[PDB]
Design a protein around this ligand. Structure first.
Ligand code: C8E
Ligand code: C8E
Ligand code: C8E
Ligand code: C8E
Ligand code: C8E
Ligand code: C8E
Length: 137
């Protein structure tokens, strides 16, 4: 994990489920100790051919543990404010907003002290994503 009392920022590519949606996101966080950090994220998803767009902003606690010196397993839990925009040909544009709990599980690999990648599955009550972050130290 990032050094205690330090910040990080990252970006991701995401995918959820015919129907496939792809998009991207950004996140920023503050690490307290090797097991606990907090993060704020923004992600969007768009429907791929053969406007359905969704966006969400979230704030979560991130709890993790080192599987190895370089690999952490982690979970995130918190809330998300979302917006989904639609485009119909009959009814024009539309959108709905909501608030929901949000969860995630993932693995993060510290490539260098400054750079880490992550692989995550996020769900609510899913979206797979790959990302990279920069640790300010
Ligand atoms: C931005 C995409 C990131 C996706 C990479 C995650 C891939 C890593 O492996 C995770 C496990 O593989 C899961 C497979 O996808 C679900 C399969 O079934 C879907 C069709 O019904
Ligand atoms: C939610 C946006 C989608 C995420 C896009 C991925 C972009 C990843 O971040 C790129 C790396 O960060 C930028 C670096 O700072 C230097 C840029 O040049 C300076 C200003 O002109
Ligand atoms: C549900 C998650 C809520 C999000 C948590 C917000 C976390 C709050 O901010 C963390 C960043 O603020 C930094 C702390 O102050 C510095 C502490 O003194 C340093 C040495 O112990
Ligand atoms: C999804 C997996 C992530 C689950 C998060 C784990 C929660 C983090 O805190 C666990 C408690 O921290 C204690 C661990 O360090 C100590 C162990 O014993 C010492 C060496 O043998
Ligand atoms: C507790 C559930 C709510 C989650 C808190 C998130 C609160 C954050 O602010 C939400 C309002 O801000 C609007 C977001 O759109 C802009 C985001 O940043 C742009 C892309 O990088
Ligand atoms: C103590 C280690 C940290 C692990 C705690 C993380 C807690 C994670 O679980 C939260 C509960 O998960 C929510 C699941 O319910 C919704 C599932 O999807 C709807 C059916 O397909």
């Amino acid at each position: 994990a990032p050094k205690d009392n330090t910040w990080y920022t990252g970006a991701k590519l995401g995918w959820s489920q015919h129907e496939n949606k792809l998009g991207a996101g950004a996140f920023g966080g503050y690490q307290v100790n090797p097991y606990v950090g907090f993060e704020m994220g923004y992600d969007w998803l768009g429907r791929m051919p053969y406007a359905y767009k969704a966006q969400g902003v979230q704030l979560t606690a991130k709890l993790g543990y080192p599987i190895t010196d370089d690999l952490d397993i982690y979970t995130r839990l918190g809330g998300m404010v979302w917006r989904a925009d639609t485009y119909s040909n009959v009814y024009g544009k539309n959108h709905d907003t909501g608030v929901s709990p949000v969860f995630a599980g993932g693995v993060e690999y510290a490539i260098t002290p400054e750079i880490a990648t992550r692989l995550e599955y996020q769900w609510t009550n899913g979206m797979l994503s790959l990302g990279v972050s920069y640790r300010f130290g």
